[PDB]
């Protein structure tokens, strides 16, 4: 499987999109970035021009005006219009994100100090997922020869240290996955940048998110609410595979 | 000598707040240097569990030298403690004390022609509560805390159940620190409001008051609503920890998310309490060095009032991923966006003030112009984050970190520096050397941009907040960020050197007004320094 959902060296952009929701984030953020780059370039050029044009050596006697009604109206209305515009594209995206569709696949995820528990209620499957290199795998949260070997054995490399877990959440491509998220002890947060999803894992509350993965591969997230000493060391691995490979994985877990 | 501390005069209190805020600022900045030493490269090299088995002193000195990874057991608790300390010190014990407690106490009475604050003895007590709060915050770092170590590693906003389950009493000491800070702030606010309303000089009508005095007035109202709410939130944490209550614990029918609503009800107003007095200073400075009256005096006041009011109805933009309904999310997103409008009016009016002026590029003016550019960069990133749909990705990443440092460390702090250079002659009777002021500005300008701009990239790539260590792919921009922080630190040490030189052997200030006639408020009408008793 291709490693797709991960940070890349020197990156300045988003992680690759592997869902339609993540695609929407990239577009909306792209649209707003163009706007805010324009606002700030504009503001900056006005400053530098005014300093050049009205420097004390070049403009010896200062004006005394404190009003300019047309301009004052313009500089109120234009910001209002810019924002209504952003709102108009942004609210649909928001609605698409937060309206949970019908599930093809349901996963219940529980955050623990410091690991994730997964349950597939339709399949009667459950397991826990620990960082490769955590105490659970024999480590103490740092790279070592043993950790590199374990990363190799699981189908990764040393580059995926801090992202790869001993077990993965596996799901079929092109299906709607609904994930129900809660916390067992403190608040954690479950996320996968490539899917454009993030939902806090709050003790006592079950919250939902959805994604539909559009290509097969490996996608990482990391716990996103400070939850104590090993907050940096309880990440997320999702493997998106074919419909047939997903069934194969399921049967592997079936107890006869 | 030692009666500097028992003084009830607004000018002496103001100076004490400024100096103290400066010293706590040094401490909090030193923490970030150590933070950026650890973030400079992937793998943990500094914050090793091995250093815990030494002395307090020896362990400290060992932790400043890098170890090989194979000899360094990562100690996440120390990262979490450092970060929490950095945040608490800044938000409670540095920047508001400097702006509000410092410049506010010194200059507001001068600007309205009052001889002193309404209740000077209360003002002196304000200061001691700030010092007591600071001492408790600092002590929390050395008290039994989480994971059988010292200090609380819970984040500056103290989310339960993490904050309520942290072992030791370090967290209790932190909560008491924050109570003392709130008390100091509330007393200050009582004084500012009473003085502003009752003790203006004859002729000094509401619409003749200088913008800085207005900024302090509005700020003071925000404190009166916001700080009591915080006192409630953190008292409930205290009772959950020590007195058997169950406000935020699901086993007793509590809800951790309830704490977040209460905390952020204070938490948003907090940032407008920080930045408003800096808006006030920028107005005075730009008017002075543009040699031109401030554009749109009335819209400037009303924009501050609007920012202040709107700052109370937006809090849940800090909670988009915490389980808010789609309706709540949609509302808070739209309410937040509105803030850009009055803020935009102030930025354009500052530019309009410069337009047609006679610009002098002295040090205070450099800070003000940096503020306009840099606060804009931060504000516009705040607008990105208001969009819940994009905040889905950015929440609890370094993009948020970049936002808030642009508005605070390149915004409010630039306002603090503008004020220092603007007013040091007036307060001390000595002038800062101009070439050194400009050098400080440029080093800080280059350094702080190098520190924080790359954090936008880190956030876009998915780097979470509050992490001691990170995947190897985040290395490049973390390295650049750390070099920026080291340069910024050099600029701050140089600044302290400039202050030391100024107060010790700076050129003697001779004029009441050593700037120009367009510095037209009452302080410039008095000697430098002003008489012990003014007005
Ligand atoms: C001085 C302190 C300060 C200030 C002034 C602000 C100002 C603003 N903040 Fe920021 N913020 C913080 C400090 C501050 N913030 C901190 C500390 C946090 C993190 C808390 C934590 O979790 O620890 C945070 C986090 C934070 C979040 C949560 C992000 C997350 O956790 O996922 C959000 C979300 O909406 C936000 C938004 C905004 C907005 C819209 C503004 C607006 O006020 C900005 C308005 C200004 C401008 C927009 C620029 C000037 C305007 C123009 C030039 C007009 C034209 C512009 C347009 C049409 C857009 N902030
Ligand atoms: C005023 C607010 C403020 C300021 C100025 C700063 C300054 C700095 N901060 Fe701050 N930072 C916060 C508020 C602030 N921070 C908060 C609230 C958090 C969140 C904590 C949490 O997660 O719980 C945070 C988190 C935070 C992080 C992320 C930690 C993590 O997620 O694990 C990082 C990472 O590099 C960082 C770095 C820095 C650096 C390098 C500087 C500086 O070194 C930059 C350079 C600036 C200077 C050298 C000058 C500073 C001047 C003053 C402070 C004025 C002093 C007063 C007088 C002179 C009168 N900060
Ligand atoms: C949205 C981005 C923000 C950009 C900020 C830059 C603002 C620059 C525009 C200001 O324009 C000036 O305004 C003056 C005041 O309105 C005009 O003076 C006019 O009106 C004055 C008011 O009495 C008279 O004294 C003058 O003679 C008369 O020229 C002047 O012509 C005009 O150039
Ligand atoms: O998915 C979303 O479905 C919504 C339908 O539930 C639509 O919301 C739209 O329709 C709603 C009607 O209830 C409005 O309240 C929303 O503001 C508006 O964005 C929106 O287009 C669409 O992308
Ligand atoms: C990092 C923090 C940065 C903070 C920068 C701001 C520094 C301002 C400090 C000024 O302190 C002033 O020092 C004066 C001395 O220079 C004092 O006058 C004192 O000394 C005079 C002699 O010089 C006497 O005439 C006066 O009676 C006596 O009050 C004056 O009251 C005091 O306020
Ligand atoms: C820990 C942080 C490390 C940061 C170290 C910062 C190093 C500072 C560089 C020292 O060089 C200075 O440069 C000034 C500027 O060129 C000179 O001022 C000279 O030049 C100015 C002209 O701009 C004049 O105003 C002055 O009167 C005149 O002394 C000054 O003498 C000289 O010593
Ligand atoms: C970590 C600690 C960092 C320490 C950094 C401290 C920075 C403060 C340096 C102050 O520099 C002074 O500036 C004066 C003002 O420019 C110079 O006066 C010079 O210039 C004046 C103005 O022309 C002349 O009248 C003087 O005689 C001539 O000495 C003076 O030489 C120079 O030392
Ligand atoms: C794939 C696009 C990469 C562009 C990264 C730039 C993000 C910088 C945000 C700062 C906005 C200030 C105007
Ligand atoms: C339909 C989108 C509404 C956008 C809200 C922005 C208004 C702020 C001024
Ligand atoms: C392998 C030798 C490299 C030397 C590292 C020196 C680090 C010095 C840091 C001390 C500065 C304290 C803030
Ligand atoms: C008075 C001439 C000195 C050279 C000044 C350099 C230009 C300063 C630009 C100010 C913009 C700061 C963001
Ligand atoms: C590739 C753009 C580099 C930006 C440098 C940060 C200032
Ligand atoms: C691979 C080990 C890298 C550690 C280098 C230490 C550099 C520390 C410089 C600190 C600067 C403080 C001002
Ligand atoms: Ca490191
Ligand atoms: Cu966690
Ligand atoms: Cu966590
Ligand atoms: Cu806010
Ligand atoms: Mg969070
Ligand atoms: O905020």
Query: How far is it between the farthest Cα atoms of chain B?
Result: 73
Q: How far is the C-alpha of A90 from the C-alpha of A77, rounded, in Å?
A: 20
Cβ neighbours, 10 Å, residue B395: 26
DSSP letter string over B440-490?
HHHHHHHHHHHHHHHHHHHHHTTPBSS-S---GGGHHHHHHHHHHHHHHHH
Q: Are B103 and B11 a contacting pair, CB within 8 Å? A: no
Spatial neighbors of A170 by CB under 8 A, at least 6 apart, are: A238, A239, A240, A241, A246, A249
Closest CA to B132 of B93, B159, B76, B83: B93
Q: Are B131 and B207 a contacting pair, CB within 8 Å? A: no
Cβ neighbours, 10 Å, residue B22: 19
Catalytic residue among B185, B363, B451, B482: B185
Query: Cβ < 6 Å from ligand 11: which residues?
Result: A 51; B 361, 366, 369-370, 373
- DSSP helix/strand/coil, B394: helix
Contacts of A32 in chain B (CB under 8 A): 383-384, 387, 390
Q: How far is the C-alpha of B347 from the C-alpha of A10, rounded, in Å?
A: 34
Measured between CB atoms, which of A61, A65, A224 is closest to B464? Answer: A224
Measured CA distances, B166 to A232, B149, B405, B446 (Å) = 18, 11, 28, 39
- DSSP helix/strand/coil, A1: coil
Q: How far is the C-alpha of B427 from the C-alpha of B530, rounded, in Å?
A: 7
Measured CA distances, A83 to A44, A58, A70, A77, B336 (Å) = 20, 38, 20, 10, 11
Closest-CA residue of chain B to A160: B471
Q: How far is the C-alpha of A90 from the C-alpha of A86, rounded, in Å?
A: 6
Q: How far is the C-alpha of B474 from the C-alpha of B366, rounded, in Å?
A: 33
Question: Is residue B440 less than 8 Å (CB to CB) from chain A?
Answer: no
Domains of chain A and any CATH numbers: 6-101 (1.10.287.90), 102-254 (2.60.40.420)
Closest CA to A226 of A189, A199, A196: A189
- Residue holding tokens 């931060």? B378
B91 burial (CB, 10 Å; 0-12 / 13-18 / 19+) is buried
Q: How far is the C-alpha of B323 from the C-alpha of B320, rounded, in Å?
A: 7
Catalytic residue among B270, B395, B481, B515: B270
Closest-CA residue of chain B to A51: B359
Q: How far is the C-alpha of B233 from the C-alpha of B428, rounded, in Å?
A: 41
Spatial neighbors of A41 by CB under 8 A, at least 6 apart, are: none
- DSSP helix/strand/coil, A170: strand
Elucidation method: X-ray
Contacts of A224 in chain B (CB under 8 A): 321, 395-397, 464-465
Q: Are A152 and A81 a contacting pair, CB within 8 Å? A: no
Closest CA to B139 of B171, B182, B95, B91: B171
Start-to-end CA distance of chain B, whole Å, equals: 25
Closest-CA residue of chain B to A36: B380
Closest CA to B88 of B129, B140, B40, B12: B140
Can you read off the two tokens belonging to residue B366? Answer: 């450099």
Can you read off the two tokens belonging to residue A161? Answer: 């240290």
Q: Are A108 and A121 a contacting pair, CB within 8 Å? A: yes
Dihedral (Cα; B15, B20, B22, B28), 10-degree rounding: -160
Q: Are B517 and B480 a contacting pair, CB within 8 Å? A: no
Q: Are A98 and B329 a contacting pair, CB within 8 Å? A: yes
Distance from CA of A228 to the nearest CA of B (A): 7
Query: Cβ < 6 Å from ligand 4: which residues?
Result: A 91-92, 95-96, 99
Contacts of B383 in chain A (CB under 8 A): 32, 36, 83, 86
Start-to-end CA distance of chain A, whole Å, equals: 29
* Sign of CA pseudo-dihedral B228, B320, B347, A80: negative
Query: Is it true that the peptide bond before A114 is cis, omega within 30 degrees of 0?
Result: yes
Question: Is residue B445 less than 8 Å (CB to CB) from chain A?
Answer: no
B352 burial (CB, 10 Å; 0-12 / 13-18 / 19+) is buried
Contacts of B340 in chain A (CB under 8 A): 79, 83
Q: How far is the C-alpha of B217 from the C-alpha of B108, rounded, in Å?
A: 9
Question: Is residue A72 less than 8 Å (CB to CB) from chain B?
Answer: yes
Q: Are A170 and A239 a contacting pair, CB within 8 Å? A: yes
- Residue holding tokens 């955050």? A111
Answer whether A202 sits within 8 Å of B323, measured CB to CB: yes
Catalytic annotation on B272?
yes
Can you read off the two tokens belonging to residue A208? Answer: 């939902």
| CA A108 from centre of chain | 19
Catalytic annotation on B440?
no
Q: Are B130 and B13 a contacting pair, CB within 8 Å? A: no
Q: B1-535 adopts what CATH topology? A: Cytochrome C Oxidase; Chain A (1.20.210)
- DSSP helix/strand/coil, A109: strand
Which residue puts its alpha carbon closest to atom 8 of ligand 9?
A: B338
Q: How far is the C-alpha of B95 from the C-alpha of A129, rounded, in Å?
A: 43
Query: Is it true that the peptide bond before B529 is cis, omega within 30 degrees of 0?
Result: yes
Can you read off the two tokens belonging to residue B418? Answer: 């503008």
Question: Is residue A23 less than 8 Å (CB to CB) from chain B?
Answer: no
- DSSP helix/strand/coil, B158: coil
CA angle A157, A163, A165 (to 5 degrees): 85
Can you read off the two tokens belonging to residue A233? Answer: 């060391």
Answer whether B330 sits within 8 Å of A12, measured CB to CB: no
Q: Are B21 and B130 a contacting pair, CB within 8 Å? A: no
B392 burial (CB, 10 Å; 0-12 / 13-18 / 19+) is buried
- DSSP helix/strand/coil, B5: coil
CA angle A27, B376, B318 (to 5 degrees): 65
Strands A176-183 and A3-5: unpaired
Closest CA to B131 of B181, B185, B189: B181
DSSP state of A232: G
Can you read off the two tokens belonging to residue B460? Answer: 């876009």
Strands A3-5 and A217-221: parallel
Cβ under 8 Å to A: B residues 406-425: none
Can you read off the two tokens belonging to residue B100? Answer: 């509000």
Q: Are B217 and B119 a contacting pair, CB within 8 Å? A: no
A108 burial (CB, 10 Å; 0-12 / 13-18 / 19+) is middle
Cβ neighbours, 10 Å, residue A247: 12
HSE-up of residue B324 (Cα within 13 Å, Cβ side): 23
Contacts of A65 in chain B (CB under 8 A): 295, 356
Q: How far is the C-alpha of B145 from the C-alpha of B81, rounded, in Å?
A: 9
Question: Is residue A139 less than 8 Å (CB to CB) from chain B?
Answer: no
Q: Are B111 and B521 a contacting pair, CB within 8 Å? A: yes
Please report, for chain B, the start and end positions of each structural domain, with discontinuous segments joined by +.
Answer: 1-535
Answer whether A62 sits within 8 Å of B292, measured CB to CB: yes
Can you read off the two tokens belonging to residue B361? Answer: 């590029």
- DSSP helix/strand/coil, A205: coil
Q: Are B118 and B195 a contacting pair, CB within 8 Å? A: yes
* Sign of CA pseudo-dihedral A194, A195, A196, A202: negative
Strands A125-129 and A115-120: antiparallel
Closest CA to B92 of B130, B65, B64: B130
> Which atom of ligand 11 lies nearest, measured to the CA of A57?
1
- Residue holding tokens 């603090």? B416
Mutation test residue for ligand 8: of A8, A10, A11, A12, the one with most atoms within 8 Å of CB: A12
Q: Is B224 in the pocket of ligand 13 (CB under 6 A)?
A: no
Spatial neighbors of B139 by CB under 8 A, at least 6 apart, are: B173
Helices (H) and strands (E) in chain A, counts: 4, 11
Rg (CA), chain A: 25
Strands B430-431 and A236-241: unpaired
Question: Is residue B460 less than 8 Å (CB to CB) from chain A?
Answer: yes
Measured CA distances, B119 to A83, A91, B157, B195, B241 (Å) = 45, 50, 32, 8, 37
Q: Is B334 in the pocket of ligand 9 (CB under 6 A)?
A: yes
DSSP state of A15: P
Helices (H) and strands (E) in chain B, counts: 19, 2
DSSP state of B409: I
* Phi, psi for residue A211 in degrees, rounded to 5: -150, 160
DSSP letter string over A47-82?
HHHHHHHSBTTT--S-------HHHHHHHHHHHHHH
Strand partners, B144: B150
B26 burial (CB, 10 Å; 0-12 / 13-18 / 19+) is middle
Q: How far is the C-alpha of B452 from the C-alpha of B395, rounded, in Å?
A: 17
Q: Are B488 and B448 a contacting pair, CB within 8 Å? A: yes
- B277's enclosing H/E stretch is helix B256-290
Q: How far is the C-alpha of B360 from the C-alpha of B439, rounded, in Å?
A: 16
């Amino acid at each position: 499987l291709e490693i797709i959902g991960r940070p890349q060296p020197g990156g300045t952009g988003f992680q690759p999109s592997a869902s339609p929701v993540a695609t929407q984030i990239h577009w909306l953020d792209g649209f707003i970035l163009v706007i805010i780059a324009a606002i700030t370039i504009f503001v900056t050029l006005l400053i530098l021009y005014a300093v050049w044009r009205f420097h004390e050596k070049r403009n010896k006697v200062p004006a005394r005006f404190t009003h300019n009604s047309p301009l004052e109206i313009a500089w109120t209305i234009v910001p209002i219009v810019i924002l209504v515009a952003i709102g108009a594209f942004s609210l649909p995206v928001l609605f698409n994100q937060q309206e949970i569709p019908e599930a093809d696949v349901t996963v219940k995820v529980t955050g623990y100090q410091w690991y994730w528990g997964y349950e597939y209620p339709d399949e009667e499957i459950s397991f826990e997922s620990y960082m490769i290199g955590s105490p659970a795998t024999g480590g103490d949260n740092r790279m070592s020869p043993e950790v590199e070997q374990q990363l190799i054995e699981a189908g990764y490399s040393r580059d995926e240290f801090l992202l790869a877990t001993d077990t993965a959440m596996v799901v079929p491509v092109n299906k709607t996955v609904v994930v129900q998220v809660t916390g067992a002890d403190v608040i954690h947060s479950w996320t996968v940048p490539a899917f454009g999803v993030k939902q806090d894992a709050v003790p006592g509350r079950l919250a939902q998110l959805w994604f539909r993965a559009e290509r097969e591969g490996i996608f990482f997230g990391q716990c996103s609410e400070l939850c104590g000493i090993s907050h940096a060391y309880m990440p997320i691995t999702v493997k998106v595979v074919s419909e047939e490979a997903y069934a194969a994985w399921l049967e592997q877990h079936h107890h006869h | 000598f030692t009666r500097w501390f028992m003084s009830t005069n607004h000018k002496d209190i103001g100076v004490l707040y400024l100096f103290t805020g400066g010293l706590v600022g040094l401490i909090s900045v030193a923490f970030t240097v150590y933070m950026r030493m650890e973030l400079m490269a992937p793998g943990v090299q500094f914050m090793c569990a091995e250093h815990l088995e030494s002395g307090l002193v020896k362990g400290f000195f060992q932790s400043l030298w890098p170890s090989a990874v194979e000899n360094c057991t990562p100690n996440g608790h120390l990262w979490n403690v450092m970060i929490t300390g950095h945040g608490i010190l800044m938000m409670f014990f540095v920047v508001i004390p400097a702006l509000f407690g410092g410049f506010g106490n010194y200059f507001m009475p001068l600007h309205i022609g009052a001889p002193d604050m309404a209740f000077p003895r209360m003002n002196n007590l304000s200061y001691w509560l700030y010092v007591a709060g600071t001492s408790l915050a600092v002590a929390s770092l050395f008290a039994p805390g989480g994971n059988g170590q010292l200090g609380s590693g819970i984040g500056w906003v103290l989310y339960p159940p993490l904050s309520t389950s942290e072992s030791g009493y370090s967290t209790d000491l932190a909560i008491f620190a924050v109570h003392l800070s709130g008390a100091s702030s509330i007393l200050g606010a009582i004084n500012m409001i009473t003085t502003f309303l009752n003790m203006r000089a004859p002729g000094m009508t509401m619409h003749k008051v200088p913008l800085f005095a207005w900024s302090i007035f509005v700020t003071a109202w925000l404190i009166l609503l916001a700080l009591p709410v915080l006192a409630g939130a953190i008292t409930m944490l205290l009772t959950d920890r020590n007195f058997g209550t169950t406000f935020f614990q699901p086993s007793g029918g509590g809800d951790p998310v309830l704490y977040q609503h209460i905390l952020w009800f204070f938490g948003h107003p907090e940032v407008y309490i920080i930045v408003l007095p800096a808006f006030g200073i920028v107005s005075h400075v730009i008017a002075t060095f543009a040699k031109k009256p401030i554009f749109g005096y009335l819209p400037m006041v009303y924009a501050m009032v609007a920012i202040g009011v709107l700052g109370f109805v937006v809090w849940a933009h800090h909670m988009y991923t915490a389980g808010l309904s789609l309706t709540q999310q949609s509302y808070f997103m739209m309410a937040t966006m509105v803030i850009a409008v009055p803020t935009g009016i102030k930025i354009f009016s500052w530019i309009a003030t410069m337009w047609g002026g006679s610009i002098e590029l002295k040090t205070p003016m450099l800070w003000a112009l940096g503020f306009l550019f840099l606060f804009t960069v931060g504000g516009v990133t705040g607008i990105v984050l208001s969009q819940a749909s994009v905040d889905r990705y950015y929440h609890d990443t370094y993009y948020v970190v970049a936002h808030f440092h642009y508005v605070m460390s390149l915004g409010a702090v630039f306002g603090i520096f503008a004020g220092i250079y603007f007013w040091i002659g007036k307060m001390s009777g000595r002038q800062y050397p101009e070439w050194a002021g400009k050098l400080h500005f440029w080093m800080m300008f280059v350094g702080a941009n190098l520190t924080f701009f790359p954090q936008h990239f880190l956030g876009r790539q998915g780097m979470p907040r509050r992490y001691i260590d990170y995947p190897e792919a985040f290395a490049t921009w973390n390295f650049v960020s750390s070099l920026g922080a080291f340069l910024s630190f050099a600029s701050f040490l140089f600044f302290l050197g400039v202050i030391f030189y100024t107060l010790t052997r700076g050129a003697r200030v001779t004029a009441n007004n050593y700037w120009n006639e367009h510095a037209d408020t009452l302080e410039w009408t008095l000697t430098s320094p002003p008489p012990e008793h003014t007005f």
